[PDB]
Each structure stands twice: as C-alpha cells, then as structure tokens.
Design a protein around this ligand. Sequence first.
Ligand SMILES: Nc1ncnc2c1ncn2[C@@H]1O[C@H](COP(=O)(O)OP(=O)(O)CP(=O)(O)O)[C@@H](O)[C@H]1O
Length: 700
Amino acid sequence: MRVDELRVDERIKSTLKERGIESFYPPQAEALKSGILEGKNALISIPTASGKTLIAEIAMVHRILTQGGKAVYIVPLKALAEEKFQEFQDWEKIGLRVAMATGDYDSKDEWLGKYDIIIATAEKFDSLLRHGSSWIKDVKILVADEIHLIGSRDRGATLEVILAHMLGKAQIIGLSATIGNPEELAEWLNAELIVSDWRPVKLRRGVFYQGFVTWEDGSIDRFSSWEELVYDAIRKKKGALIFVNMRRKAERVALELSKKVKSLLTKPEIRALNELADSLEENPTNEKLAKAIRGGVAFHHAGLGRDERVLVEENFRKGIIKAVVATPTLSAGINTPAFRVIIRDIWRYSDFGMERIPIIEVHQMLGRAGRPKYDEVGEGIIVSTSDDPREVMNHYIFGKPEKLFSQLSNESNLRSQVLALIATFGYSTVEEILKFISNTFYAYQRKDTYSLEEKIRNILYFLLENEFIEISLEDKIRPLSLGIRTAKLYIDPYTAKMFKDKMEEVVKDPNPIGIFHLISLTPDITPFNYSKREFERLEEEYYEFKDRLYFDDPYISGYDPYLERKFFRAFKTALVLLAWINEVPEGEIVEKYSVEPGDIYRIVETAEWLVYSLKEIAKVLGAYEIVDYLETLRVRVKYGIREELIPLMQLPLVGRRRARALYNSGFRSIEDISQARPEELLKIEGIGVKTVEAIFKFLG
Ligand SMILES: Nc1ncnc2c1ncn2[C@@H]1O[C@H](COP(=O)(O)OP(=O)(O)CP(=O)(O)O)[C@@H](O)[C@H]1O
C-alpha cells in the first residue's frame, strides 16, 4: 500500500516522503493494518530486509501524537542505540524530541522526562524501571527490537522481565527474525501476529561443498574453492560478506582473499583503498586491517575500535571495500547488505564444547544477502566442509528455525531480578513473587514452574543470608540498605556480595591492581582473554603483586583449567586497567598486554561502572574512608588519566592524550584555558584547530 493511504497523523506521511518512501512492502502493509494503529500489540516476524523499523516508527509516533506521552524503543546493544538515534532524528522536525539512554544504571535520569522518544537497551530500561523514574508512567508504547533475543541466554531474561512488567501497562510491539514459535510469543504478548516470508530482493539460498554450490532448487554451479565465490562476486562488480566464527580467522581469511582480490580491481579503486588504509592510527590490529584493505578486503570484529569498524561498514556500503570477513558478534553494525553472503563456518565454539550455529542465526546472516538498488537476486551460500551438503540443506534451508525458550532460569539475571522485585518494585511475600512469574514467558510456555519456584526460594536464602534482605516483624520480606542500593546499581547481587566480603581488605589496602582484579572477577565484566604464551609472564606479574590482591587464590574452587583461567583473565585485565589509568598510550597497551582496542574501550567503560558500584557498596557498609579514593579511581578509570588531569576532562574533544599535552604545556585547569589565546593552544602538539574551536566554544 501507499504511504498516504495510511490513516495516521499527516505529519508522519510527510516525513516518510521527505525520506524516500512512497509505498509499503506487503509485510509492512499487513502490519500497519494489523491493529497497531489502534494501539494494539503486535509481533512482526519478517526478514530484516523487509523494513521492521519503519513499522515501529510509524506506530510509535502515531501513538504519541494521537495520545501524547513517550515511545520507548529497545535495541540489543548500546552501539545500536546511536544508529537508531540518528535514523530517528528526522522526527524532531515535527516536534518530537528524541534521546538515548544506554548506561548510568544508578540514576532515575529524570532529564529524560522532557523527551518523546527514548532509545534504550533492555538493561538501561530495566534499571530505569527499578529507580521508578516519574516519566515511566508516561510511556504509551515500547518497541522490543530483535525480540527473539528473548530466547538468548546471556541477556534474554532481562528483555523478558521488562516486557512482563510492561504488558497491559503500555502498547507492546515486537520486531523479530523468523522463529519456530511466533504464535506462542505473540499470544504471551497478547499480540497480533505478522509472519511474512516476503523480502525486497529475491534470495537464493545454497550450500557449497567439495567444489560445488547446490541451490534449494536442486541446480548446481561450479566454483573451484569457496573463496572463488568471492572472487566471482568482485569480477561481476558485486559485494561479498563472508561470515566467520573467530577474530583471527576473520583477519587471516581477509588478508588471504585480498591477496587475490586486488588483481580484480582497477587503478582508481586501488588508489581509494590506499588513501583509506592511509587514514588509520597505527596499531597491531590496524596493521592487519590496512594491509588487507589495500586489496579490497577488510575484516570486521569486536576487537576493532568504533572508528575502525564504522570505517569498514561505511566504505563497504559505499562499494570501495569489495569484501568483508566478519564475526557475527557486533555484526549488526554492518547494516550493509551484500550480493553474496557466504557463511564460512557453521560450527562455533560453545561454552561447553562444539555446537552448530542456530538456524535462526543462519537465516539472519543469509537474509542479509541481496542489496535492493544493485541486485535482482541475492545469493546466500552456506559452506560445508565436514557436514553432509544434503544434510546442511535440510537443516537450514528446508528446516524451520528453532523455537524460542525463556531463559528466566538464569541464576544470574534471576538473582538480580528477584532482589529487584523486593528492593525496587515492593514485593514482600513469596506468594507475590510467583504471581509475577506466573505472568512471565517462562510460565506461559510451561505447564508448571515448580523448578523455578525452588531456584527463587534458594535465591531468597542467598539474599537473606547475605544481608541483602530481611524477614520483618510481620512475616514479610523487606529490602535493606544494601539491597535497594544493589538493585539500583544494577550490578549482580553476587558481585555486590563479592564487594561486601572483600570490603575489609580493600579498606586495609586500597590499591589499583587489587581493586581492578576484584571487579575483573565479577559476573558483570567479561575480562580479557590470554594466550598460552602470555601465561608465563602473567604468572610472574602475579607473584610480584600477590600481596596487593584481595582474592589471592587462583584455585579456591579447584584446578579446573577454567578456574585458573578466570582468575588470570581477571589479573591480566587489572594490569591493563593499571596501565590505562597510568596513561600508557593505547597503541602501547594493545602491544604489551596483547589486547585489542574495542576490548579496551568496553572493559574500561564497564570497569568504571564497577569501581563506582564498589564505592557505592562501600558507602552502604560504612567504608567511608575509601570513598574519596575510589571516586578518584573511578574518574581515572573512565579516562585513563592520572589524578591531575581530571579537571581538564570536561573540555570537549579532550581525552588522555590532549589532556596531558595541555597540562604539560602549562594549562592545568579550566581557568588556565580561559585566560589564553588560541595561538597558544595550537602550539601544543595534539590540539588541532577543531579542538580549540570546540574548547573556546565551550568556554563561552
Ligand atoms: N517502505 C519502505 N520503502 C523503502 N525503503 C524502506 C521501507 N521500509 C524500510 N526501508 C529501508 O529498508 C532498509 C531498512 O533497514 P533497517 O535495518 O533500518 O530495518 P529492518 O527492517 O532491518 C528491521 P531492524 O533494523 O529492527 O532489524 C533501509 O535501507 C530502509 O531505509
């Protein structure tokens, strides 16, 4: 159907045209006339090429202009908050103020109250609901994007709890990938179900093996080696997105391709890639990317920094980069389709042994094949090396996607959520906690939740014994200072426990390595991994600082190669964080501690929230003497700077490097910066014209 036919506020229709939309894809039409316009709940399960977002926006903005209030959009990761934030900007033109919310769990973020569209992660929104922000009752609609992640172990439970809290309290719209149980998820959400197999460009799915690609129609096409599929894509001026399981593999396979891909390029093309590779700050990770890019092939994974990944996604979408070998982790960032999508690996490293890539994911990767403007047909090829080609075809192509199961049974999120229900949503009887649970997706799918009730009761004993809660003088559960505080910090009740137990020791010896090692051993941070060749050196580093650690034993749980692992992962991480606050250059940190940019960025951001929560836990326990020290450690962790550089950090575009260049040149305070001519600041190596402009602009 056409835009204008949409019986919605005229201002929406206008924006859709100013964009470029005149008509809707069948799935969209079906969804837009499902009843979501009437404020009804709906589960839209259609391929991502089909425009799920647009449906949500129209629905959101509509609900908001016709009934006032706020529309909450839930994205999977912080990095995807920005993309959504940008593509939602045009709604400001019609009066709707848009905002992002992804961190700072320990805050009501009341400032958000003055906004009409809030883009937050499930975690951020969970925290906000815990803090009971006054603008929450204002929300008329919440869109759960990538809602199939509800069946995801690591974070699915959180997405479910926020949903269970919201059902019947606001409109709920789910945007998901094809699954095995849409009807079930829909009925739980008491929602209209929109299932469509429709997509913009035709998709051709095939399985490559021993030198041949068999498609779903039984036909065949010769290709010497799988990589011939790529060289073939480029010789036809098309793109190739190769999916791999490991970071090093992504890099190797990219370098290898590029060697042969350059010869299929042009003199102008080579030049564009050259200037491109010539625009990257030197590094062990950037060396590999550049050398590879100079051949039209780039790799993409979580180990690269935001700049570098954004640069690959963009120059790929722009056809400059001819191919991209990426890990499916931060994959989504590549909102960049491709003529041919090759799934190189179908067996990933499980957290137990070996497992095939879930069908749902294989479809999401394949469905990412075929660019609208350039292709009339996209080709998704699954490579089989061990498996039977006929079997691979049966599992993925002809077989339906796996069914989604609630992951509420996650002790981690469940411990955190049982305490929240008491510490922030006012639950005081076990009979009440099961009433909530009876309305969850877990209880929907199940005939009984008896096993869950048991977990919950044991969770209560853990919270009860660990002073997180108490059974009042009326035979009722009521939170304690430590409990509210913990639920509000959004840290896992278990990591808070770790903080309380070790508190005495931190008070006694408040040191960087000890604190960094402590938090790096918590369920709220994913430490740095290490290779066998880093162990030896790590062991020495360890003994050298054993006296400073609070958790001084790598084996209090056993000899499991995995326990000694977790502990040294935490220790290496603490050394990295030490060099970080110690102002060691990023290219140097990456080199010495054998770690990657994207990881440093992530660990640093999390460590800060953890050093902060450690400070807030110390407060609810009386350890007031380490509170100032911890706050100064928090601010140092946040920027990777020494104590004196702290006042300069409020300056725009001023990080570790520039703050030091300014301080070492005499400008130690904001007052020092103010009483200065631009000529002076520009003489300092590292402060360019754009920085001085932002700085003086900041100073009035
Ligand atoms: N009716 C329409 N007409 C033309 N283009 C449309 C459209 N609806 C959506 N699109 C476009 O199709 C593509 C949308 O990709 P986007 O990644 O934002 O959404 P999605 O459908 O993949 C769901 P999500 O992002 O939540 O997975 C974009 O290029 C967008 O501009």
